[PDB]
Amino acid sequence: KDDVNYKMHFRMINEQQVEDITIDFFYRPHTITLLSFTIVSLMYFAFTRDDSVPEDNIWRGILSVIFFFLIISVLAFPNGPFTRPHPALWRMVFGLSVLYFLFLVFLLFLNFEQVKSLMYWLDPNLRYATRNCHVITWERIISHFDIFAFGHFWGWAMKALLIRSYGLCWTISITWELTELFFMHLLPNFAECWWDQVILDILLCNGGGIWLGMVVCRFLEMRTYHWASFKDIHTTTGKIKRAVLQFTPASWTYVRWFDPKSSFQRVAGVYLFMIIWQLTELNTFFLKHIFVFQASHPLSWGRILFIGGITAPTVRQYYAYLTDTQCKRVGTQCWVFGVIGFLEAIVCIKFGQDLFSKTQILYVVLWLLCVAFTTFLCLYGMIWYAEHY
Amino acid sequence: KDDVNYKMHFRMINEQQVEDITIDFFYRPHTITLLSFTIVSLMYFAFTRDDSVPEDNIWRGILSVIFFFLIISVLAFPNGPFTRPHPALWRMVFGLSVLYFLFLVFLLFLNFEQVKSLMYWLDPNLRYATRNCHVITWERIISHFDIFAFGHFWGWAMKALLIRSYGLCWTISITWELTELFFMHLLPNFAECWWDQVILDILLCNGGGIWLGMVVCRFLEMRTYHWASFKDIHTTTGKIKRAVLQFTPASWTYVRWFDPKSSFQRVAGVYLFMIIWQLTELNTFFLKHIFVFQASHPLSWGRILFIGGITAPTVRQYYAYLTDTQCKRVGTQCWVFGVIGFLEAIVCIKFGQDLFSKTQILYVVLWLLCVAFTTFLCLYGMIWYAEHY
Ligand SMILES: CCCCCCCC/C=C/CCCCCCCC(=O)O[C@H](COC(=O)CCCCCCCCCCCCCCC)COP(=O)([O-])OCC[N+](C)(C)C
Ligand SMILES: CCCCCCCC/C=C/CCCCCCCC(=O)O[C@H](COC(=O)CCCCCCCCCCCCCCC)COP(=O)([O-])OCC[N+](C)(C)C
Ligand SMILES: [Ca+2]
Ligand SMILES: [Ca+2]
C-alpha cells in the first residue's frame, strides 16, 4: 500500500493542511454565505450599473470575471506547500497563475498587430513609447540605486532564502548579468554602462541580496517554532507580535540540493532547475524589448512581482519532487510555473522575429550554448566541492 | 476529532476515490508528459499556423483557451460524487461549468446590443431569426414526437433516475407544463395547441420518462455490483461486456428524501430543491424568448445538454448535504449549479425588460406566487402521505 504514502506525500506538497487550529473561524467554510454574497453583489451590479458606455462594460466584465475566478480558486484550487498566512491567499495566487497561463495560450494565436492593439487598449500611452562612463563620478555611481535596484535586492534576497545555496545563486547571478551585458551590446538600447552590470549589479545588489537571504535562511533554520494561540496571549504586545508573525513561516524546511553520493537524475534535475531559472530571466528581457514598454510601466513590474509570488511555492514543490523519494507527482503550481515559462519563451520567439538579424540570431544561439555549458561546468564544480570538501 | 469525519465526508461527496483499481495505467498521473505535450502542441501551432485572418485568430484562441482550461481542470479541479467512467471526465464537466458561470458573470455587464453582437458573431444567421386543434387528427397528433420529444423523454428519465420519487417528479412536471401553457397564452408565440402541453407532454413524454427512470432506479437498487477485472475475464464477450459496463454506475445510492419523522430544515431543503428546479425550467424558456433562437440551434440544445450533464452530480451532492448529518459542506459542483441557475435568472431579468408590459409582469408574478404555493401544498401532501401511509 505504498500508493497511500505516495498520494499522502502529494497532498503534503500540493495541499498542505493547517496544523493546530485554535481560532477556528478563520478555517470553517461558509460557501453558502459566499453563494448568497456572489448572487446579491452580481444582482446589485446588474440592476443598478449604467451600461451605456460600451468600452467600460468590457473592462468591468473582465475585472469581475477575474474576481469571481479568484472566488472559484478559493473554493476549488489547490493550496500548495504553504499554509501561511492563509491557504486561501495561495489558492488565489494559483488562480492568477492559471489566468496568466490561459492569457499566454490565447496570445499565441493572434498576430503582432492584434497584440499591439490589445496592449494599446490597456494603456493608450504605449503608442508613443519608443526603444557615458568615461567621466566617472561617485555621485553618478550612487545615483543608480533607484526603487528598481531596491526591488532587485529584495528579489535576490527571496531567491537566496528559498534556494539555500551560495553556488547556485552566484552562478545564476553572474551568468545572467553577463548574458544581459552581451545582449545590451548586441542591441543599442544600452544606456547605463559596463561598470553597472559588472560591479553595481553582480557585487552589490545581487551579492548583497544573496548574503541577506542566506543569513535569514540560516536563522530560520536554527530557530524553534513554538506558536502560542492568539487567544492564550494575555499581553497586548504579545497579541500584536503573534498577529504580525502570522505573516511569517510556521516552520522551515532544511534544503540540501546535492547529497554526498548523488544520483544522475538528481544532478540532471538541478541542471534543469538552473536552466529554467535562466529561461525565466530571459523572458523578462525579451518581453520588455519585443513589446516596447519601460520598466516603470505596470506591465513590467506587475509581471515581475507576480512571477516572484508564484516562484515562492514553485521552488519548494520542485525541491520536494526532486529530493523526496515518495513524492511521485509534480505539484500543480510547479506545473503551471513551468508552462508559463515555456509559453513566455514561445511568445518571445513568435513575436520576436524583428529584434535580430540572422547573424545576430546566430550570435544569440552561440552565446546561449556557451551559457548552458558554463552553467553545467559550475554545477559540476559544485558537485565536486560537495563530494570532496 | 469529528472534524476528521466532516472533512472525510466532504471528500467523499466532493472528490470520490476510485476503489479496487486493477488496470493501473488509467489512474497513474503523467503530468510531465502532459506538460511536454502542451508545450509542443502550442509550439507547433505558434510556429506553423497562418495568423493573417484576424477573426480566425480570435476563434482559435478561444477554442484553445477552452481546451487548456479543460486540461487545467483535469489537473486541479474536483471530481464530484462520481468516479465512473473516469473521474477526469467529471473534472472536465466541472471546468465547463466554471467557464459557463464566468461567461454569465461577464454577460451581466454588457448591454443588450453588445450581447446581440456577441451572438451574431457566433452564428451570423441569428440576425434574421424572428419570434389549429379544431381539426383534430391522429396523424398530426403522432407527428409531434420529433427528436426533441425524444430528448425530453430521456431527460425526464435521467431526472427520475436521480431523484427517486414519483411525487417530486410529477409535481414539477405538472406545475412546469401548466406554467409553460400560461406563458404561451401570455405570449402569442404559441403555435402547437392546448392538447400538446396537456396530454402529449404531461402524460406521455414526461410521465413515460418518469416511469422508465423509476423502473431503472429500482433495478439499480436491487442489484449486486460484483465487478471483475478486465484482465481476469477470459472470454471476449465478457471483456466487451465489462468495457461497456465501465460506462454505468459502479454502485447505487439508496435515496429517500422524506423520513417518517423529518425535521423542518429537511422539508425546507426539499422545497428549495423543487424551487431551484422550477427556476432552471424557467431559465430555458426565458433565454429562448429573450435572445431569439430556435430549439434546433446549437445554443438551445447545447445548453440543455450541458445543464443535464452537470445536473447528474448536483442531485447526488445536494442529497448528501441535505440528508447526511456529517457532510458539513456543500459540494462545489452543486455550488456552481446554483450560481449558474441564479445568474441565468438575473440575466433573463436584466435583458428581459422588453418581453412583458407592466400588467403582464403583474400576471407573471402572481402566477409564480401561485406556483410556489402549489408546490408547497404538494410537498406537504407528500410529507403527510409518507408519515401516515
Ligand atoms: C537556442 C538556445 C539553445 C540553448 C540550449 C540549452 C540546452 C540545455 C537543456 C537542458 C535540458 C536538461 C534536461 C534534464 C532533465 C532530467 C530531469 C530529471 O531526471 O530529474 C528528475 C526530476 O526532474 C523534475 O523534477 C522534472 C519536473 C519539471 C517540470 C516542472 C517545470 C517547472 C520548473 C521550475 C523551475 C523554477 C526555477 C525558478 C527559480 C527562480 C529527478 O527525479 P527522479 O530521480 O527521476 O524521480 C522522480 C521523482 N521522485 C520519484 C524522486 C519523487
Ligand atoms: C417574482 C416571483 C416570486 C416567486 C416567489 C418564490 C418564493 C419561494 C422561495 C423559497 C425559499 C425557501 C428557502 C428555504 C431554505 C432552507 C434550506 C435548509 O435549511 O435546508 C438545509 C440544507 O439546505 C441546503 O442544502 C442549501 C444548499 C443550497 C445551495 C446550493 C444550490 C444548488 C441547488 C441545486 C438544485 C438542483 C435542482 C435541479 C434538478 C433538476 C437542511 O440542512 P441542515 O439541517 O440545515 O444542516 C446542514 C446540512 N447538514 C449539516 C445536515 C449536513
Ligand atoms: Ca542587470
Ligand atoms: Ca412543454
Q: How far apart are CA B378 and CA A277, in angstroms?
A: 65
- Find the A108 Cα to ligand 1 centroid distance in Å: 24
Instruction: Name residue, grid cell 404538494.
Output: B378
- The answer to whether the CB of A201 falls within 8 A of the CB of A207 is no
Q: Rg (Cα) of chain A, in Å, rounded?
A: 24
Atom 35 of ligand 2 has which residue's CA nearest to it?
A: B273
Please indicate the experimental technique that yielded this structure: cryo-EM
Point out which residues pair with B89 in neighbouring strands.
Answer: none
- What single DSSP character describes residue A247? T
Contact between B65 and A102 using a beta-carbon 8 Å cutoff: yes
Give the number of other CB atoms < 10 A from CB of residue A214. 18
Grid cell in block for residue A237: 504586545
Contact between B35 and A338 using a beta-carbon 8 Å cutoff: yes
Grid cell in block for residue B151: 430528448
- What single DSSP character describes residue A80? B
Contact between B335 and A78 using a beta-carbon 8 Å cutoff: no
Q: How far apart are CA B344 and CA B105, in angstroms?
A: 9
Grid cell in block for residue B152: 425530453
Is the four-CA dihedral B192, B196, B201, B202 of positive or negative sign?
positive
- The answer to whether the CB of B73 falls within 8 A of the CB of B333 is no
Q: How far apart are CA B333 and CA B90, in angstroms?
A: 10
Q: How far apart are CA A366 and CA A350, in angstroms?
A: 20
Q: How far apart are CA B270 and CA B114, in angstroms?
A: 39
Grid cell in block for residue A174: 553572474
In this structure, the residues whose C-beta lies within 6 A of any atom of ligand 1 are A 159, 265, 268-269, 271-273, 275-277, 280, 311, 314-315, 318, 321-322, 324-325, 327-328, 330, 334-335, 337-338, 365, 368-369, 372; B 32, 35
- The answer to whether the CB of B379 falls within 8 A of the CB of B270 is yes
- Measured CA distances, A299 to A123, A198, A269, A305, B329 (Å): 10, 27, 31, 10, 39
- What's the start-to-end Cα distance of chain A, in Å? 40
The resolution in angstroms reads 2.7
Can you give the residue ranges of every domain in chain B? 2-388
Q: How far apart are CA B357 and CA A125, in angstroms?
A: 47
Q: How far apart are CA B50 and CA A376, in angstroms?
A: 38
Cis peptide before A85 (omega within 30 of 0): yes
Which chain A residue shows the shortest CA-CA distance from B91? A76
Nearest to A15 by CA among B11, B210, B147: B11
Contact between A51 and B342 using a beta-carbon 8 Å cutoff: no
- The answer to whether the CB of B252 falls within 8 A of the CB of B220 is yes
Q: How far apart are CA A84 and CA A101, in angstroms?
A: 25
**What does the buried/exposed string (b/e) look like for A46-67 if buried means 16 or more CB atoms within 10 Å of the residue's CB?**
beeeebeeeeebeebbeebbee
Best of A272, A283, A363, A374 to mutate for ligand 1, by most ligand atoms within 8 A of CB? Answer: A272
Q: Rg (Cα) of chain B, in Å, rounded?
A: 24
- Measured CA distances, A110 to A59, A290, A354, B14, B52 (Å): 20, 15, 16, 38, 9
- Measured CA distances, B374 to B161, B283, B370 (Å): 24, 20, 6
Backbone torsion region of residue A80, taken as left when φ is above 0, otherwise alpha when ψ lies between -120 and 50, otherwise beta: left
Point out which residues pair with B80 in neighbouring strands.
Answer: B15
Give the number of other CB atoms < 10 A from CB of residue A126. 17
Residue A113 with chain B: CB contacts under 8 Å: 54
Grid cell in block for residue A128: 508613443
Helix (H, G, I), strand (E, B) or coil at A54: helix
Nearest to A328 by CA among A17, A8, A16: A8
> What single string gives the DSSP state of each residue in B337-381?
HHHHHHHHHHHHHHS-TTT--HHHHHHHHHHHHHHHHHHHHHHHH
Nearest to B176 by CA among B152, B151, B211: B152
Q: How far apart are CA B133 and CA B135, in angstroms?
A: 5
A133 min Cα distance to partner chain B (Å): 42
